[PDB]
Amino acid sequence: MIRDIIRMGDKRLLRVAPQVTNLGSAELHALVSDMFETMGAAHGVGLAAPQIAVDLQLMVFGFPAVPLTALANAQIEPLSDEMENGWEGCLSIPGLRAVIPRYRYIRYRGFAPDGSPIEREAEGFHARVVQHEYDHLVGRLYPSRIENFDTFGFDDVLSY
Numbered sequence: 086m087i088r089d090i091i092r093m094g095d096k097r098l099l100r101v102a103p104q105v106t107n108l109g110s111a112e113l114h115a116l117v118s119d120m121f122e123t124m125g126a127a128h129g130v131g132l133a134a135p136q137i138a139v140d141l142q143l144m145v146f147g148f149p150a151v152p153l154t155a156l157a158n159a160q161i162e163p164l165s166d167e168m169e170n171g172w173e174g175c176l177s178i179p180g181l182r183a184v185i186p187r188y189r190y191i192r193y194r195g196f197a198p199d200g201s202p203i204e205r206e207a208e209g210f211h212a213r214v215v216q217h218e219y220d221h222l223v224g225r226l227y228p229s230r231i232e233n234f235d236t237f238g239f240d241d242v243l244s245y
């Protein structure tokens with residue numbers, strides 16, 4: 086079941102989400118399946134539960150190949166201070182994109198929907214997706230991270 090994605094301006098994207106506590110359950114499995122379908126229909130590479138107005142620490146991502154992943158109760162830590170600039174957009178901000186700095190190298194930990202633990206090092210684009218989705222879980226959107234406002238604009242127009 087494809088879910089409506091809420092758009093920037095909705096207060097529900099500004100919340101700090103609570104932890105998932107129904108790992109291995111049918112209800113979580115149905116939510117995650119809905120999230121992959123929703124992401125798929127929207128042509129995304131990530132989707133966070135607050136974007137479909139579900140207040141939980143849950144994201145799905147994947148597609149430089151990023152493994153298809155469902156991640157609950159995510160924790161992230163940089164593995165160096167090295168930042169890298171790259172293009173981001175957001176399903177809740179359709180048509181736009183900007184250049185955003187992120188950590189080039191991270192580790193992320195949490196749980197798969199069946200309750201097994203996940204722990205991975207990631208770099209580049211893989212790492213960026215995860216940081217971007219993690220931001221949704223703490224009520225943060227990418228415009229609050231732009232440094233160079235010349236890069237912010239509509240996808241079909243931008244020539245940076």
Ligand SMILES: O=C(CSC(=O)[C@H](Cc1ccccc1)CC(F)(F)F)c1ccccc1
Binds near residue numbers: 129172174217218221
């Ligand atoms: O459609 C997008 C941009 S929209 C998107 O998928 C967001 C994830 C994202 C894309 C690119 C960089 C960082 C995060 C998801 C959000 F909005 F749910 F939180 C795309 C970008 C690069 C390659 C292929 C497709």
Ligand code: NI
Binds near residue numbers: 125126128
């Ligand atoms: Ni399509």
Ligand code: NI
Binds near residue numbers: 174175176177217221
């Ligand atoms: Ni987003």
Ligand code: NI
Binds near residue numbers: 208
């Ligand atoms: Ni490497």
